[PDB]
Design a protein around this ligand. Sequence first.
Ligand code: HEM
Ligand SMILES: CC(C)CCC[C@@H](C)[C@H]1CC[C@H]2[C@@H]3CC=C4C[C@@H](O)CC[C@]4(C)[C@H]3CC[C@]12C
Ligand SMILES: [Cl-]
Length: 439
Amino acid sequence: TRFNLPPGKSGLGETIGYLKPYTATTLGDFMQQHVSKYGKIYRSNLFGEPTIVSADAGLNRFILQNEGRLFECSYPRSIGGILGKWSMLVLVGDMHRDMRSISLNFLSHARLRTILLKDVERHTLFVLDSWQQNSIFSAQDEAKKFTFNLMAKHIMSMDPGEEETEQLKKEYVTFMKGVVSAPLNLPGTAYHKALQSRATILKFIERKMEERKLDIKERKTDDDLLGWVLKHSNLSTEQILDLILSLLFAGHETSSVAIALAIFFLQACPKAVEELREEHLEIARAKKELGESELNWDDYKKMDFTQCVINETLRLGNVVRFLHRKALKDVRYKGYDIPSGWKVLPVISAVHLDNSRYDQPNLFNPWRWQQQNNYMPFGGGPRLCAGSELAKLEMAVFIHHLVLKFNWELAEDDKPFAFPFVDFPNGLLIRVSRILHHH
Ligand code: HEM
Ligand SMILES: CC(C)CCC[C@@H](C)[C@H]1CC[C@H]2[C@@H]3CC=C4C[C@@H](O)CC[C@]4(C)[C@H]3CC[C@]12C
Ligand SMILES: [Cl-]
């Protein structure tokens, strides 16, 4: 083959072993064994392609920052099949840049600080005020309701707990299993089921688009993303559809996982919950003195220990395990040959769990962040998560009201696994009890 390729078993495929589920607060047996035997940069045959796998933090940074120059986003076909050819995980170059710009304006700082913050709180309370005490229920399911409803409101003005919002959410439950499965469009497979849901979702959104276009004729309307792209962009119908469909997927499957992880880590770390309660009680009490009832951006900026808990939740729990890229030309990195056209997987989660970068890396220790290259849960470079500031705001507002209203406990054993999407197999069943006297 090539003398300076990274070592490996095989440049004979290893996809099944690579994808075998593992405990989400580790890298799993397959990755650990390959790194122990071959080193942090190794070769394999994965997803049908010769592949370089990187658990090396410096190479991962280099890959992400040289997007569009030496490396390019290159996901398996199931992603583009389900999220669409105009989604941001498929688009490259100028079209990707323009889609990203639209996304950034809509999670733009100004809109985020004002209108979005206020909806985030209202949706947090819609969920928390429905919870019954001393009754087993799935925290993972409730977190996805919160974040999906919030996105449906922001993108298409859909109201939470209305029938059409609940039915739309049910369609999204098929997506993640389809995205990670073989792209066999055959009756009964997970990919076929997600494509059927895609068809249903697309029909729903395009009907709402046609209604909104009539509304804009009769001058009734651009306060949500759908209205915005209709009036202020020249995207085509299909481009709008994939933008909306894929942002609702992000609303189902990203920050909801993070919130479920936080609820799990925190019930095993009561000292962190006590310190969160002090922080949030002080914010609430100050607001009550002023007569304020809604959070504002200045309140959010006070949530310093909450940010420590958010950073630690993302570091330990690793919502995203690795990203898909390909080499755009031959790259020779510290002696290793990365040939043109090969797949390249930056395992962004690896640096988070490296005991030479983080003391006791498998421990939930939010104080490692307090008053404090090694942290990339949102990716990096020109594809750095465009929702990251909304994701942190959702987590923080949800924790704010969670710790003020309730104590909680696990109803049974559970722990998160990576499939590679992160999921609590037993649903993170909890019970809550209402706090009647704060300290
Ligand atoms: C803790 C929660 C989240 C995590 C860990 C996360 C992680 C990521 C990662 C790793 C990527 C890069 C994918 C790649 O480059 O291959 C990404 C991209 C993206 N994410 Fe997030 N995300 C989260 C929440 C959100 C939310 C709430 C939204 C709201 C829509 C969002 C929207 C986006 C968008 C639009 C991109 C594409 C950026 C681009 O291609 O330029 N994400 N996310
Ligand atoms: C497209 C825009 C709207 C943003 C999407 C953000 C979220 C949904 C993206 C960012 C990182 C993505 C993950 C990155 C890598 C992989 C591994 C691949 O083998 C299966 C899909 C999976 C697990 C992706 C699932 C979707 C994901 C979590
Ligand atoms: Cl050779």
